[PDB]
Amino acid sequence: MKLDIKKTFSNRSDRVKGIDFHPTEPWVLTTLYSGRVELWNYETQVEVRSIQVTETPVRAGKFIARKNWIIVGSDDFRIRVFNYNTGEKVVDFEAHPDYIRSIAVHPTKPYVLSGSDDLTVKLWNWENNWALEQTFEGHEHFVMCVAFNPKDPSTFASGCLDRTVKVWSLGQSTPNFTLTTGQERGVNYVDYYPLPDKPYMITASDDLTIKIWDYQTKSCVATLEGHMSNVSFAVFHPTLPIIISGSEDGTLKIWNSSTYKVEKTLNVGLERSWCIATHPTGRKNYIASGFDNGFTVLSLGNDEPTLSLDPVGKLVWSGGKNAAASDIFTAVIRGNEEVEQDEPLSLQTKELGSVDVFPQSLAHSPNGRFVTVVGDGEYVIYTALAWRNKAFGKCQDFVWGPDSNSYALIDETGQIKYYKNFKEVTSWSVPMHSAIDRLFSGALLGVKSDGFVYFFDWDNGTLVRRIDVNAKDVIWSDNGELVMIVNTNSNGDEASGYTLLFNKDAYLEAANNGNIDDSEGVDEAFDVLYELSESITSGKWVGDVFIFTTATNRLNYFVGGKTYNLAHYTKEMYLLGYLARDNKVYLADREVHVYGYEISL
Template identity: 25%
Template structure:
């Protein structure tokens, strides 16, 4: 599990993701509703009008609205743009457990301890249907994603599937099957009225009260979670519904369960402090994640992203089950990347993409990283699945031979090429092993505190230590340089290997090849990726955060080039007429090309392009404006004299001191 964001608060009873913005709502046991930006890790707003715990919360998929339901028996509809409650819906006689918007109709679905489910029209602000049938608290009720169905879970130990097509025909504006049908067949009118919603299936199988039930996004499946510590999988058709299997493993009441939208997985959490991930086909527990003290109460999945949130006694966590960063390697203008278990090759100049070979290992998991030996056309692919770390060595297809069908395998936390016929593998016991192309050990080096190895050219390796990065000469078995950078995740070199950018979770540190630090930048958002723009006389590092493409110059100047809607991973910066093309991969491992304007970093730091910077400012005839962007003393002196700013000119002259 990869924790992306964590909050500390009172007990979280309800969670809802915004469909498009990086926002999440958390409803708390103390009556507060929090609106968080999980990308920037900031609390945007608090809404505090409920009296007592708020258990139900849901964003509208299109409108700037959300709905909440609490222990004060009230359903409130809020406008987050206006930052206020628009109106309150009254009618329930006991605690409200869940509230959900319909994806298409102007409806709200609520479940309550008064043993009823209610459907409300939020436009007319009226209750349009009351569904009775459960004989204990109704803990959860949710709409089907596409059909006129809803599912409810109750402490009466049953799960019920309801058909509300009658309500739709009665309430929603007449369409081809509404008024037209009635006019054609007036004799079919039911004298006693048509039921708004009828029970289609009653699912009985749990031995204790059922806390949650939800539909699969696309398959005719239901998952339920109950106080009998079981997660049950149900299948349904038009005629009947039946139990498929049971997932056992929780040690206490199961609070919530849902389907993974993209994979055949079920997620559940419980008062036993565990989140468990189940294989939907084998019904086995694949992974489990435990908190030390806090019980879990609710789970929520993002409608489009591979992102989940879980609410517990002391706040909530947002997490992913696995990394979405694609594995790739670059050589000159060729990008090698893995997509859908296939190694592909993209010519970035000609924009030609072609498959190379099939990748076999890793099961359902994505590769963690890859390292390319372009001289021998060999590829190292690394996987990290739980505590198991493995690598596979593939021989790519050549003119004289085909690709290897069966790779050579080994166990190591990471594997990187150090020569055309040698690669290094870091074992779990912190021992560095040098192997040949036949996967045979040729040398061993003790690295007691090394956590990760990274490429540093022929015969060299970068070793990530807990608080620094060291440059190791593999032949001499000794460290020749070191720089104090904590928890470095990636090392990215420029084309001539004279500069390296060391990326941390929130930091970018640029060093020389001897690890002499030139500058360091700290970001509020996570740093995702980067590449050097070598088209300028002095290379500029172009990097991405979760929501921006940025630049960083050697003297420490940095800034925003453009914003991003979704995170991307920069692999190469190509120069073109009057612009720069940033080649990147998205989270689906699809290559994209973004065009950026290099003017910002070209004039932002005159050490990058002194003549171009100076010339463009002089031609623009705005030296006083350019003066605000330039840091280099000589250029500042020239610009200050042009615009008559004697104080700045004197300051620049003193700093030059010639």
């Protein structure tokens, strides 16, 4: 992967010991060495509420959102709850005759965990008036960190400086098992891997190392040593295949959970790294951290490769090696470039602009006027000339209409919306009752449900036809007569695609008649001209000719039932377009290096 980190919100503050994300509200909570607690809207960069709780460091703070509470533990032996809507001290008691290090909140049950230097862990029931239900003994030193198994909240790990982790079920005075860590300086932190495909855990030590454990088989999977000083935390991101550690060396290390190699190192500049949080449900992939000098909120995306070519020859992409995933760049193509075959074109990168989301993909309007970037549930539309904004919104799919001034979406509820003039047509409705896999552009809006393909008239929305083919892609000719229906071949039983001719007349007649069969459409509007052999990875029409890439990486052309190979490349090659000026077709590889191939009989 190529991770990308955006610095959402940073606050210089006293030593930040505890830190937690609210799950619905864009709020980070922080517990300080100063006995003060803070609530920040990291998204509008505003301090909501802040309480002077104690003179003593408060080390553990967590959200119980469901009861609209914050819960915090200090060095005065105490546990205190507050309502954050009101700032009103709900509860305040003595929970251990020693420091309180760590707190865990039960996902569902009114159950709250606290770990202590008193050697013990303890269970607390709030809707039975905070009575101490069970006291877990066994550890022979400071209990640094408690953690519920997200997959089985009846059980929980506890990381201890006595060099062990101890998993217990709610009820037994004894542990199910006890994990000697080998980490001769002790465990500061423990975290569960959230996904059901691995029973992994993780620890972090003063001994500079991080350790991944299998808790079924009870064995050390891997040692991950980076850090130059004591490792403070190590956690699994809820959503990206990463581990995140932090430490007194001042750094944050983002590790890869598969290769166990450090993907990314950050020196936030707040000195020593104390504590960690990840937005519960991956929102913006937020992770937040606490330091000697304060806290930061970081969003983590990916620099996925994007490129759209325009008809007149302009390339536009996001990201890159020397650059950021959400920076936009543009480059012009001219027959200029000496026709050397398999070397990437050299062009001059001009800065074009920026965008607020992590692209997964990017695409010009048909006429090359506008650019749409799609990502992270959001779509955005920019002017290609001075990178001016023209539209934003949420979408699971975006497809451009012929006009180059209208489009269609699958929205946050999975329902097709149609915009005309950047300003939605409310009345335009296509009632789709199955689930919508996808959306295609071209001269009829294409909609994939089941192993089917529906074709609707752009202006009204009436089903022009339904094709019973499990399409991968749908690629139209520019003059609107031809279409190629690429087939998700799925074990080469069927042909890889089908040419179809579209009679618009046959549609319009069945339109006047009111004889459009709302299940199928119009049998006469679509005729199957040919079937295709080899698999199709991408493809452009150039008149009656279909230029296409294969999974053998070969470049072919199809014209009137015949497949002629034209070149045989040796990478993953994708088609970008056909410039007539340079009589040239243009290709892109996995690294966005652009190639040019020349075409004549």
